[PDB]
Amino acid sequence: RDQAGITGTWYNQLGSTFIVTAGADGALTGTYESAVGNAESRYVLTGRYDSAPATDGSGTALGWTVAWKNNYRNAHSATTWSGQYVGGAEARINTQWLLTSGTTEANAWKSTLVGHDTFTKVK
Template identity: 35%
Template sequence: MQSKHLRLTLLLALGTFCASRPGPAPNLAGCWTNQLGSTVSIEVAEDGTLRGTYTSQVSSTGDQVKGDLIGYQQMFNQPTFGFAVKWTTESVRGSVTVWTGQMFNTHGHQTLMTMWLLRNNTETIGNNWSATRTGQDVFRHCGVKCESTEGSGDLGSQWKCDSSVGA
């Protein structure tokens, strides 16, 4: 009888241990949109390296600008990350922006809370004081891919999450 209780106790302990083990860490793969309608598309390698593209709806020229993204993600339940964007659109070429932040899963929604630094290229050291800007962005997960929709109106209306994938 004591042997049966011991086995039952061990089975319950093992079941509790297995049930409490976390699943694979979430990652930043997919499409994300911020509060201004800018969109980032990210692919994540097994080692946490990030690659992708960023399309900003806001710029000093007032035009949509694009850039190449590279960065890293720490593989935790609510991962931390950092990425840099080298702007490739002619009007902002020479500028680089870096973001750092953390992904949060709240009420079934994935959100990236970030801070950023934008460095503009400057011709002289005298202009150094105004060449770096700071700010924050909140991104929401849109799904697997980003989709461009032509249109006009509010800043966020030109880029939408693809409605064919789960938001």
């Protein structure tokens, strides 16, 4: 439905690269490359999207996760993005995210960053 609209290469305001395939079943698969933080090269992502969204002009809800471990680095952390895809000439994925680091129990109060990323099809 928005399978075609979501599948592809997206870029956020930080210059990160989100490469995703949307499956007919609601699956999101792909790779993420962050332009910032304790990260290098590509990381696996997986997520889900609403494969039968409302037809009233609403966006398409979706989310995905990256664990920041690959063959190069392990930042002992994971980010989830929660948001919606908005189609059209200037298609966008508007997200908020939560980045949790593994911590000791004494430090768990400072485990989680929150922010917002907007992805577009052009950098």
